[PDB]
Write an enzyme that holds these catalytic residues in place. Structure first.
Site, PDB file in Angstrom:
ATOM      1  N   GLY B  46       0.893  -1.171   0.000  1.00 27.85           N
ATOM      2  CA  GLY B  46       0.000   0.000   0.000  1.00 27.85           C
ATOM      3  C   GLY B  46       0.913   1.197   0.000  1.00 27.85           C
ATOM      4  N   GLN B  51       2.379  10.098   1.566  1.00 23.60           N
ATOM      5  CA  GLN B  51       3.703   9.505   1.827  1.00 23.60           C
ATOM      6  C   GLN B  51       4.738   9.926   0.804  1.00 23.60           C
ATOM      7  OE1 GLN B  51       1.933   5.380   2.363  1.00 23.60           O
ATOM      8  NE2 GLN B  51       3.927   5.262   3.420  1.00 23.60           N
ATOM      9  N   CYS B  90       5.178   0.033   7.653  1.00 29.07           N
ATOM     10  CA  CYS B  90       4.865   1.160   6.835  1.00 29.07           C
ATOM     11  C   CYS B  90       6.179   1.619   6.158  1.00 29.07           C
ATOM     12  CB  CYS B  90       4.292   2.243   7.751  1.00 29.07           C
ATOM     13  SG  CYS B  90       3.763   3.810   7.014  1.00 29.07           S
ATOM     14  N   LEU B  91       6.136   1.881   4.850  1.00 31.00           N
ATOM     15  CA  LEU B  91       7.325   2.459   4.152  1.00 31.00           C
ATOM     16  C   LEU B  91       7.845   3.786   4.721  1.00 31.00           C
ATOM     17  CD1 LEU B  91       5.987   1.571   0.623  1.00 31.00           C
ATOM     18  CD2 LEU B  91       7.714   0.319   2.102  1.00 31.00           C
ATOM     19  N   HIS B 132      -5.328   0.990   6.878  1.00 28.62           N
ATOM     20  CA  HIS B 132      -4.001   1.569   7.151  1.00 28.62           C
ATOM     21  C   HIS B 132      -3.746   2.732   6.177  1.00 28.62           C
ATOM     22  CE1 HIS B 132       0.581   1.034   7.881  1.00 28.62           C
ATOM     23  NE2 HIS B 132       0.477   1.859   6.853  1.00 28.62           N
ATOM     24  N   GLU B 133      -4.060   2.521   4.882  1.00 26.14           N
ATOM     25  CA  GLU B 133      -3.838   3.572   3.846  1.00 26.14           C
ATOM     26  C   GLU B 133      -4.754   4.743   4.108  1.00 26.14           C
ATOM     27  OE1 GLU B 133      -1.253   3.713   2.333  1.00 26.14           O
ATOM     28  OE2 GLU B 133      -0.699   1.724   2.985  1.00 26.14           O
ATOM     29  N   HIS B 136      -3.544   7.323   6.708  1.00 23.75           N
ATOM     30  CA  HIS B 136      -2.664   8.363   6.074  1.00 23.75           C
ATOM     31  C   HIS B 136      -3.387   9.609   5.592  1.00 23.75           C
ATOM     32  CE1 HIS B 136       1.050   6.313   6.461  1.00 23.75           C
ATOM     33  NE2 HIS B 136       0.653   5.266   5.756  1.00 23.75           N
TER      34      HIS B 136
HETATM   35  N1  LIG Z   1       2.393  -0.894   4.040  1.00 26.24           N
HETATM   36  C1  LIG Z   1       1.089  -0.296   4.238  1.00 26.24           C
HETATM   37  C2  LIG Z   1       0.090  -1.381   3.907  1.00 26.24           C
HETATM   38  C3  LIG Z   1       0.001  -2.397   5.024  1.00 26.24           C
HETATM   39  C4  LIG Z   1       0.695  -3.587   5.117  1.00 26.24           C
HETATM   40  C5  LIG Z   1       0.335  -4.310   6.240  1.00 26.24           C
HETATM   41  C6  LIG Z   1      -0.626  -3.562   6.885  1.00 26.24           C
HETATM   42  O1  LIG Z   1      -0.826  -2.333   6.102  1.00 26.24           O
END
Ligand SMILES: NCCc1ccco1
Ligand SMILES: NCCc1ccco1
Ligand code: NA
Ligand code: NA
Lengths: 161, 161
Positions: B46, B51, B90-91, B132-133, B136
């Site tokens: 994601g 980001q 998360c990146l 999660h996205e 952000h």
């Molecule tokens: N890297 C953001 C997306 C993600 C991966 C696992 C939970 O969220």
């Protein structure tokens, strides 16, 4: 001898450490010697024994000037309820910092590695260092004390006051 | 064109993003193209527009298989109260992971970059990625959702189940 500092995620940082019972021994002096040295190589102001995977109630700290100190079997009491926010980082969580509330005023007690008793009142940054090192001895790290997650971030990036 | 991913501590990750209003345009297609590419170079599942310092309600995700998707102006509703714990990274917070409670079941709605409407029910990991996205887009990162701080640590070190 410089020791490896273990990183957050290692279960050994999550333990409650037993007491030091070799005050005055050559083995404790060498462990403490190692700790100041390891702390120095990593540019630390505090280092707790669990951070180098030694399960003991022991911390070194020091360098507003904080006196260089090796403290065994530390016990801490707040001297009032005043909290103060301040920046913390940790050698076991490299690159990051957050703002953390700590007590402005403490007394801490324990022993120098030679066995002589230590008891001090401390305030501000001196007091914060000791509370942060003490958390290590009970298996607690600073992120679990963050209240404002806007202040948590990488050291080279952060622009919060 | 691969874009720089900004790291936690940058204030631009803390904003609430405005809506996308150029659905179907060549400028949006190129931004989304950049996002899949940036996400791919960094090994992500994601990536949200903030980001890469673009203040827009836009995310890419996908690769249990999750379909590759570009989603603008996302809106999410829980389909029940069941929470489920799961590993997140998360990146913008490289090296780290924690366990986070998310809704097992969601519906999400918005638009594909070409303007066509998207509405889907999702569960498990598919649903977790989208939540999660979505965080952000409202200036929220995963550490502020950690309940068990024993699960938070570096990826190569962590031994929690
Ligand atoms: N890297 C953001 C997306 C993600 C991966 C696992 C939970 O969220
Ligand atoms: N590095 C652990 C000691 C410390 C520094 C600032 C707050 O605590
Ligand atoms: Na513990
Ligand atoms: Na915010």
């Amino acid at each position: 001898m410089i020791r490896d500092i273990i990183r957050m995620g290692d279960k050994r940082l999550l333990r409650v450490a037993p007491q030091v019972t070799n005050l005055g021994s050559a083995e404790l002096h060498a462990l403490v010697s190692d700790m100041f040295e390891t702390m120095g190589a990593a540019h630390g102001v505090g280092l707790a024994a669990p951070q180098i995977a030694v399960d003991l109630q022991l911390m070194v700290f020091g360098f507003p000037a904080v006196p260089l100190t090796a403290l065994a079997n530390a016990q801490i009491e707040p001297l009032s309820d005043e909290m103060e926010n301040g920046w913390e980082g940790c050698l076991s969580i490299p690159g990051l910092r957050a703002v953390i509330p700590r007590y402005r005023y403490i007394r801490y007690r324990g022993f120098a590695p030679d066995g002589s008793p230590i008891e001090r009142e401390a305030e501000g940054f001196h007091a914060r260092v000791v509370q942060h090192e003490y958390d290590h001895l009970v298996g607690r790290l600073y992120p679990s004390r963050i209240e404002n997650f806007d202040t948590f971030g990488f050291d080279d990036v952060l622009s919060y006051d």
